[PDB]
Amino acid sequence: ITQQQGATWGLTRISHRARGSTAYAYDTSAGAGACVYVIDTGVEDTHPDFEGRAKQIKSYASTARDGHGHGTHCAGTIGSKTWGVAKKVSIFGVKVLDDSGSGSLSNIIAGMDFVASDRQSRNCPRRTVASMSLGGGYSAALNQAAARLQSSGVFVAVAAGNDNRDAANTSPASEPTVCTVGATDSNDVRSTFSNYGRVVDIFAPGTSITSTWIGGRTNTISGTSMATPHIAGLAAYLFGLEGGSAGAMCGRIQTLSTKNVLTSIPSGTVNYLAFNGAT
Structure with a gap:
């Protein structure tokens, strides 16, 4: 267990039961051996803070790179050295939204099955994660x-x-x-x-x-x-530390979560806050 001093608040929060810490506590395994696919506007894999662990591999929109930043930001929260949860995880960018931030249903769907097939051929021993920071109206297809x-x-x-x-x-x-x-x-x-x-x-x-x-x-x-990649990164972190299954991971994160500390959570909605068990 190491401590990143002066880390951004999101990281401090998921590594402590209570607010107040200025550090991000996490196991050095840091999600190594796990893979996280970011389905968004793409990922600028040339950003220095990724240390070359990020790769923009597929696009279904007009351009092939992240010309917006949304996808890169999500990728950063997942595993950038300074702002990420799983600092040693491998990141893959799948661009389904144009630089404006919009995309067709057909391209979003195609981005999802692409992850389903591509991850099969990648070396991701600890497991694979898909982070989808997008959400329009109800769609059975999606x-x-x-x-x-x-x-x-x-x-x-x-x-x-x-x-x-x-x-x-x-x-x-x-x-x-x-x-x-x-x-x-x-x-x-x-x-x-x-x-x-x-x-x-x-x-x-x-x-x-x-x-x-x-x-x-x-x-x-x-x-x-922005919240989604915290969970995507957390799962990658858990895969690389304690293992787990894709089908039981959500439940695992719920079980480990900090309970009853949030305000404005209506009855019927879970008052569960992400926690990595590092403290």
């Missing part, structure tokens, strides 16, 4: 694709949505079999924009999260898209 990816042996973490309503009307968030992620702020209050409801499985840091950005810079933004 839910089915996410379900297929999950069933194929990949742990899928998806954003709950930012409509401040039940995530039942958001996809892939509404898919029962995936791990749906809500967002919280540094004072343990549900993010003002975070969706909720029975379909949400876990909450993680999502308000004012700092991470990698395009141009080799950094940025601080908010959204369930």
